[PDB]
Amino acid sequence: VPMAREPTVIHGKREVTLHLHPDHPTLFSYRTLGEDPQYHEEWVTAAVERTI
Amino acid sequence: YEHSTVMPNVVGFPYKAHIERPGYSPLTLQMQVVETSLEPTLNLEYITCEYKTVVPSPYVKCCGASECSTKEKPDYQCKVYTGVYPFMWGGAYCFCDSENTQLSEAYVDRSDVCRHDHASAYKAHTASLKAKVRVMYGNVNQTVDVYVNGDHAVTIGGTQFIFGPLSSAWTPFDNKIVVYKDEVFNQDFPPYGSGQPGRFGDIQSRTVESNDLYANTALKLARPSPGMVHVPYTQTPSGFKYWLKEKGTALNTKAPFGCQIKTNPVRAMNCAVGNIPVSMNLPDSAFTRIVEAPTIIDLTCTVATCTHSSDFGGVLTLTYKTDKNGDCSVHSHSNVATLQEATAKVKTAGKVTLHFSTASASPSFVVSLCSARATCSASCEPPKDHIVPYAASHSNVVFPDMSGTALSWVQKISGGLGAFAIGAILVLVVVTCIGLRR
Ligand SMILES: *[C@@H]1O[C@H](CO)[C@@H](O[C@@H]2O[C@H](CO)[C@@H](O[C@@H]3O[C@H](CO)[C@@H](O)[C@H](O)[C@@H]3O)[C@H](O)[C@H]2NC(C)=O)[C@H](O)[C@H]1NC(C)=O
Numbered sequence: 126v127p128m129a130r131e132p133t134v135i136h137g138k139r140e141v142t143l144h145l146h147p148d149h150p151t152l153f154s155y156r157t158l159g160e161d162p163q164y165h166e167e168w169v170t171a172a173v174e175r176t177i
Numbered sequence: 178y179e180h181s182t183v184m185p186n187v188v189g190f191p192y193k194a195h196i197e198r199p200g201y202s203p204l205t206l207q208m209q210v211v212e213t214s215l216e217p218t219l220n221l222e223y224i225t226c227e228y229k230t231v232v233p234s235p236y237v238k239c240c241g242a243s244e245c246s247t248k249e250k251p252d253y254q255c256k257v258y259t260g261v262y263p264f265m266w267g268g269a270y271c272f273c274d275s276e277n278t279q280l281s282e283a284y285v286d287r288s289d290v291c292r293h294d295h296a297s298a299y300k301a302h303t304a305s306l307k308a309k310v311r312v313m314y315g316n317v318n319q320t321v322d323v324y325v326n327g328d329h330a331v332t333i334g335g336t337q338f339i340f341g342p343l344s345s346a347w348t349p350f351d352n353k354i355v356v357y358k359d360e361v362f363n364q365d366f367p368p369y370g371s372g373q374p375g376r377f378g379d380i381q382s383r384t385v386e387s388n389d390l391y392a393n394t395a396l397k398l399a400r401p402s403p404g405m406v407h408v409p410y411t412q413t414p415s416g417f418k419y420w421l422k423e424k425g426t427a428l429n430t431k432a433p434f435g436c437q438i439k440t441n442p443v444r445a446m447n448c449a450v451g452n453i454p455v456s457m458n459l460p461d462s463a464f465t466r467i468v469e470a471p472t473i474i475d476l477t478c479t480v481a482t483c484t485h486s487s488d489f490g491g492v493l494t495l496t497y498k499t500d501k502n503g504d505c506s507v508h509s510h511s512n513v514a515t516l517q518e519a520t521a522k523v524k525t526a527g528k529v530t531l532h533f534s535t536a537s538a539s540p541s542f543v544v545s546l547c548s549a550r551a552t553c554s555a556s557c558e559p560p561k562d563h564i565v566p567y568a569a570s571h572s573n574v575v576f577p578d579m580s581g582t583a584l585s586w587v588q589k590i591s592g593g594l595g596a597f598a599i600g601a602i603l604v605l606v607v608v609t610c611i612g613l614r615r
């Protein structure tokens with residue numbers, strides 16, 4: 126199976142802006158590892174821009 | 178010499194323990210948690226997998242009649258039809274024009290590959306914690322594996338270690354669990370014998386090799402179309418295939434405290450919560466006689482730079498006066514600051530350096546080199562990097578010292594106001610006394 130490219134990170138004040146460049150539908154998901162996490166998962170298809 | 182302490186259940190945290198025997202020089206141990214495993218206890222309920230419909234060939238009994246016979250098969254269905262006039266490639270047999278019958282038969286059965294692709298329904302309770310701890314002191318390295326409960330003693334170089342039960346009793350697994358390959362789902366599955374068609378658990382088996390089977394898929398037969406032999410039927414699609422497409426999320430991407438869920442066996446690893454009490458029993462060979470340890474007098478502490486960052490962003494300098502050169506044990510008696518080294522090289526020059534990390538604007542703590550004591554105060558500026566890829570190495574204590582700048586200003590203002598109020602009280606009391614003495 127192929128491995129997708131590493132996304133570009135942009136640091137901020139307790140925030141990360143993340144650039145995504147997929148070639149084909151990939152699954153992107155994140156969670157905050159605290160007491161009460163904040164879920165997410167998605168099927169990225171084209172170039173997007175997400176803040177985490 | 179028995180001892181006890183508590184260590185945080187955070188992987189990679191450099192915990193250091195101080196032992197002060199009154200007949201020997203102080204000793205410092207290092208304990209680090211490398212790996213943990215929360216192991217729940219599971220009871221199997223039933224096994225679900227895709228089904229397969231078995232439809233035998235029809236038996237066209239003609240110039241006569243047939244009667245349906247009951248059988249003990251899962252979701253069995255049988256009917257007899259009247260008036261069929263079947264056709265085949267060479268022509269139509271069954272001479273009798275209308276006095277023919279066809280018997281249809283069908284039932285459900287477990288699929289061929291159910292023993293490679295199935296979902297399990299479990300009940301989880303009473304998790305058991307297991308850990309792997311690395312300890313070093315003096316010249317003794319080594320890692321050990323320990324059950325984290327008060328009934329397992331492991332000996333590491335002549336020292337007996339007992340790791341007590343966890344402070345908290347929190348588990349990420351609910352009462353009911355559905356396990357599929359390497360994914361764990363917090364799901365409420367229907368009871369055995371009460372499955373509904375089209376959803377999860379339409380067919381259930383008590384075990385993968387068990388002979389019994391309960392299937393409810395609403396299999397229904399229909400009358401064949403005239404002049405053909407096909408045994409029509411209708412059936413609600415499989416519930417397992419449906420569950421595969423709309424199960425939704427998981428526990429691997431949902432668990433709190435940032436701990437990965439794995440399978441075979443079901444466990445939750447590196448899952449930081451609570452405290453781990455430690456009970457120890459050391460022999461006399463580990464300590465050093467006080468005569469052999471160098472004597473340290475006139476210990477003073479100074480700070481060069483301080484930045485309360487996640488990594489060790491502080492430099493400390495100790496000045497002293499000794500008679501001989503050897504090895505001391507270095508420890509900090511407050512959790513506001515964590516030292517990087519546990520032992521230092523003492524020399525007749527009289528200067529040693531240490532590294533510490535803090536999370537408060539104005540830290541204040543007491544540091545000991547062998548038997549001497551000293552008090553350190555520092556002014557620390559915030560760091561500039563917004564985000565780092567490594568965990569914090571401090572205890573995350575923010576409250577500044579009472580001698581800090583902000584607290585000093587608060588003290589000054591409070592003292593001024595208190596002096597004003599005291600003067601008010603004195604004037605009022607003097608006036609009242611003069612009035613009463615009249
Ligand atoms: C060869 O073909 C002849 C076609 O006539 C077959 O004769 C049919 O035999 C069946 C079997 O007995 C008869 O059915 C019977 O019908 C009466 C009512 O008429 C009913 O009371 C009986 O209980 C039974 O169902 C059928 O009537 C008869 N055909 C005719 C036109 O009378 C014969 O069976 C065939 N040979 C073989 C070996 O199948």
Ligand SMILES: *[C@@H]1O[C@H](CO)[C@@H](O[C@@H]2O[C@H](CO)[C@@H](O[C@@H]3O[C@H](CO)[C@@H](O)[C@H](O)[C@@H]3O)[C@H](O)[C@H]2NC(C)=O)[C@H](O)[C@H]1NC(C)=O
Nearest residue numbers: 207209211310311312313314315316317318319320519520
């Ligand atoms: C007790 O034993 C452990 C394991 O043998 C020691 O940890 C090991 O320390 C050495 C360096 O002294 C590490 O080697 C270096 O690791 C870095 C990691 O980036 C690598 O880039 C270097 O090329 C070099 O291989 C070794 O990795 C490390 N082992 C583990 C599992 O982390 C430990 O130092 C011993 N205790 C004492 C007091 O020395």
